[PDB]
Design a protein around this ligand. Sequence first.
Ligand SMILES: [Zn+2]
Length: 351
Amino acid sequence: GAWKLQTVLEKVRLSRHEISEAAEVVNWVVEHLLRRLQGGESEFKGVALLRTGSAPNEFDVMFKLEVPRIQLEEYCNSGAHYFVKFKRNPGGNPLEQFLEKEILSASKMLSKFRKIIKEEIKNTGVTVERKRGSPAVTLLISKPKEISVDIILALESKSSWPASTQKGLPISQWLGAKVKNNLKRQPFYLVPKHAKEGSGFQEETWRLSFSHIEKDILKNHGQSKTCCEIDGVKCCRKECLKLMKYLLEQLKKKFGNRRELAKFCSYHVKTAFFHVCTQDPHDNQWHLKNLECCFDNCVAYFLQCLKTEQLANYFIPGVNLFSRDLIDKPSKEFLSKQIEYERNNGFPVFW
Ligand SMILES: [Zn+2]
């Protein structure tokens, strides 16, 4: 009880109320816009909502677009980025006007996407800011409350997951082979996300997105089916993830005046957390009463990731989120030093 983590969890929860009401607002706007696209005659007719995914004035949502016969070409042997292409369909491809020869232009598609949402924003109390660099068409909600909502276009493919994901999702000892097999039968998504710097080639690439698998695993996170249910026993997995996210955000805000923490995000700790679930697959390794030791274990694993510059994408093992290509050594050293300090002093940044 020395770290008083339950009190920290209460602090984090208290905040859940305001964002709960912003939902009504986002729900209202977004669902309308969807109806609009679906009823119009644009290439985004087949658009639908994806429920996947703190700071209460900022949300993002994903509009998926089924597209069949998707073929993927790996971009520069990177397991995450891909060119999307199509062979000739005798019928029309609704995205045919975005192709240059066989391959899909993310830029021309996003440009068009942004264009027609702008035309459909016609009442109001809501606008869309000029392009942040980000793929998202971001909405600015004036009233009732002030809300930023980023709309992320995604392609949905119902084909088998790409080869790069072959050794990914190492959950066989934890959630089991049947769950793993069923998750991998689910569709995957492609999102036009590329680095700020980058060639025009990169700007036309798409990266794999498994946010829906992540959500499923977090919500169904126990080896026992009764984990955290009333007729079961409570684990601390979700509490550890929340605390890890909270530690990073409190640190990013404490040191927002320097560059070293700018490239770290919640996805890094979530990724590290999933690896810890794989190392410790049994519910009895996560008893709620041992919250402190479990949190400490997650923190130590994350420190080992920083030091060794190794944090493999959970779904795409060939992708190292902590490679020196992506985050320089001094940045990881800085975060390492702060996390060691926090850990040695019972996490003062929580208070
Ligand atoms: Zn549980």
